[PDB]
Amino acid sequence: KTTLFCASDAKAYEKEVHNVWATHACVPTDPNPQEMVLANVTENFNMWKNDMVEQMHEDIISLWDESLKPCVKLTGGSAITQACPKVSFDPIPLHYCAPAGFAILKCNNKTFNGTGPCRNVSTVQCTHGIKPVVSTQLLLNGSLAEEEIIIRSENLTNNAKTIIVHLNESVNIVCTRPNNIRQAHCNINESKWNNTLQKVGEELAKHFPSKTIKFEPSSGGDLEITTHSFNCRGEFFYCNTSDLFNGTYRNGTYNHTGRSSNGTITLQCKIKQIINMWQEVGRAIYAPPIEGEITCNSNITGLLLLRDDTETFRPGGGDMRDNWRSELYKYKVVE
Numbered sequence: 001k002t003t004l005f006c007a008s009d010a011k012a013y014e015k016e017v018h019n020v021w022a023t024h025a026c027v028p029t030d031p032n033p034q035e036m037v038l039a040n041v042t043e044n045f046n047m048w049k050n051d052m053v054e055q056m057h058e059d060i061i062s063l064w065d066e067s068l069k070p071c072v073k074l075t076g077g078s079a080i081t082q083a084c085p086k087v088s089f090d091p092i093p094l095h096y097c098a099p100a101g102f103a104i105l106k107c108n109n110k111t112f113n114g115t116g117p118c119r120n121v122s123t124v125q126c127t128h129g130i131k132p133v134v135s136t137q138l139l140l141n142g143s144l145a146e147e148e149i150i151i152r153s154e155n156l157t158n159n160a161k162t163i164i165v166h167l168n169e170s171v172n173i174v175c176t177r178p179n180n181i182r183q184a185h186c187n188i189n190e191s192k193w194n195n196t197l198q199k200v201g202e203e204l205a206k207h208f209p210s211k212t213i214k215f216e217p218s219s220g221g222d223l224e225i226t227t228h229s230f231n232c233r234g235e236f237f238y239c240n241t242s243d244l245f246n247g248t249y250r251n252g253t254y255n256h257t258g259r260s261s262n263g264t265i266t267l268q269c270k271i272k273q274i275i276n277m278w279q280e281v282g283r284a285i286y287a288p289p290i291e292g293e294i295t296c297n298s299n300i301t302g303l304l305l306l307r308d309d310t311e312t313f314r315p316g317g318g319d320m321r322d323n324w325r326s327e328l329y330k331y332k333v334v335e
């Protein structure tokens with residue numbers, strides 16, 4: 001309803017670019033945060049219509065402008081060139097705070113789906129620390145649901161609406177370009193992936209009860225959304241997930257159709273230079289990869305899915321606002 005401000009442990013000393021941006025965009029985190037439980041009250045929320053999401057989106061666009069400058073930016077006919085140094089890039093958590101006269105209501109219901117009424121409600125000055133992690137298909141390094149896997153959607157019957165799966169247990173994904181210089185790969189332990197998809201299939205089954213639940217790779221589109229794309233220490237990884245979203249959940253049981261090897265699914269990745277931008281319609285060109293071993297060890301904490309008897313789910317993404325919603329879903333600004 002108003003304009004928020006951000007708070008962070010960004011440090012002076014870092015040249016890591018999230019730290020720099022936060023040092024002159026945010027105020028320091030309050031060591032002593034106040035929170036007010038009101039477990040009787042009940043109010044409504046709508047994670048799909050939440051202007052904290054737009055405010056954070058604009059912040060992260062600004063952060064990426066200042067921090068990950070492309071050598072060339074193409075928007076339509078016009079090309080902007082500027083220096084594109086390699087930088088140290090590691091997202092840090094950001095808190096969104098309501099200014100004087102306003103508060104932030106947090107919904108305390110462990111299983112709240114992001115929509116409708118919520119009984120146990122607190123009031124706080126700032127959100128928890130949210131790392132602004134840009135990615136598609138898999139949500140990385142978020143915070144897990146406390147109880148059961150949660151299915152979030154603006155409208156589950158409308159198959160054009162992105163589904164956000166909030167995981168209650170993280171799944172490790174290690175992606176590495178080892179010492180082709182654009183060849184990389186990610187390793188996921190097939191045991192845990194098997195489990196979490198068994199559980200996601202269970203919850204989806206509750207919402208589509210007659211049907212068989214199939215997971216399948218992304219149909220089509222730009223590489224950014226048909227692969228699991230993300231930024232790892234400045235470099236843009238594009239990781240094939242057809243061995244990942246590839247399985248059937250039938251009779252209360254999940255069976256993985258994807259191919260593994262000695263207990264691990266391995267995704268084949270490329271580090272790319274020409275990027276379809278998430279900030280706006282346009283292209284960005286960056287310099288070739290830094291040297292040595294580029295490795296990110298991340299937690300998968302959620303999924304972005306799109307629904308096509310049988311119901312069929314494929315990985316989605318492309319609108320980074322859904323990434324922010326997945327963390328902001330339980331907050332509302334008031335007063």
Ligand SMILES: CNCc1ccc2c(c1)N(C(=O)OC)[C@H](CNC(=N)N)[C@H]2NC(=O)C(=O)Nc1ccc(Cl)c(F)c1
Pocket residue numbers: 134135136162222224225229230231236275276277278279280281282283317318319320
């Ligand atoms: C939600 N389904 C609709 C949909 C599908 C696809 C997209 C949108 C929307 N976009 C949108 O809403 O912009 C507000 C985008 C429009 N930009 C464009 N065409 N150049 C596009 N997304 C990306 O291009 C994208 O994510 N690139 C990407 C780059 C670097 C990394 Cl590390 C990364 F992880 C991802």
Ligand SMILES: *[C@@H]1O[C@H](CO)[C@@H](O)[C@H](O)[C@H]1NC(C)=O
Pocket residue numbers: 113114115116117151152153154156
């Ligand atoms: C979320 O809960 C509301 C009721 O609180 C319900 O109307 C809506 O259909 C639910 N959505 C999902 C995706 O479960």
Ligand SMILES: *[C@@H]1O[C@H](CO)[C@@H](O)[C@H](O)[C@H]1NC(C)=O
Pocket residue numbers: 147148149150168169199202203
């Ligand atoms: C996570 O959610 C699933 C189903 O939503 C449930 O079976 C499981 O017990 C939950 N908690 C875990 C695995 O810790």
Ligand SMILES: *[C@@H]1O[C@H](CO)[C@@H](O)[C@H](O)[C@H]1NC(C)=O
Pocket residue numbers: 155156157158159
């Ligand atoms: C979502 O589903 C359809 C759109 O396909 C329509 O009835 C309406 O927009 C929504 N329905 C409900 C029950 O929310």
Ligand SMILES: *[C@@H]1O[C@H](CO)[C@@H](O)[C@H](O)[C@H]1NC(C)=O
Pocket residue numbers: 223226227240241242
């Ligand atoms: C992923 O790999 C499979 C098999 O290697 C291939 O058929 C598919 O086209 C790839 N997807 C993308 C988006 O490159």
Ligand SMILES: *[C@@H]1O[C@H](CO)[C@@H](O)[C@H](O)[C@H]1NC(C)=O
Pocket residue numbers: 216217242243246257258259
């Ligand atoms: C699942 O993986 C197998 C083996 O990698 C592949 O042949 C198949 O095409 C994948 N499934 C789908 C629906 O693409």
Ligand SMILES: *[C@@H]1O[C@H](CO)[C@@H](O)[C@H](O)[C@H]1NC(C)=O
Pocket residue numbers: 090091133140141230231232295296297298299
């Ligand atoms: C996720 O967090 C870990 C630990 O901070 C970090 O090493 C990793 O690179 C992060 N992943 C991404 C994609 O930022």
